[PDB]
């Protein structure tokens, strides 16, 4: 759990595109170093990590 930031609680980029399809299932889950959050259809994907 938790490894450098923290989730960005904006929801301001919304995809318009049909893309509903969950890939991650927590921070170690999401590659590289992108957090896993809900900022899309409303399943687990990864984004940006906030300090």
């Given at each position: 759990?938790?490894k450098?930031?923290?989730?960005?609680?904006?929801?301001?980029?919304?995809?318009?595109?049909?893309?509903?399809?969950?890939?991650?299932?927590?921070?170690?889950?999401?590659?590289?170093?992108?957090?896993?959050?809900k900022?899309?259809?409303?399943?687990?994907?990864?984004?940006t990590?906030?300090?």
């Amino acid at each position: 759990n938790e490894k450098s930031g923290s989730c960005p609680d904006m929801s301001m980029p919304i995809p318009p595109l049909g893309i509903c399809k969950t890939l991650c299932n927590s921070d170690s889950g999401c590659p590289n170093v992108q957090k896993c959050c809900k900022n899309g259809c409303g399943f687990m994907t990864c984004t940006t990590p906030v300090p």
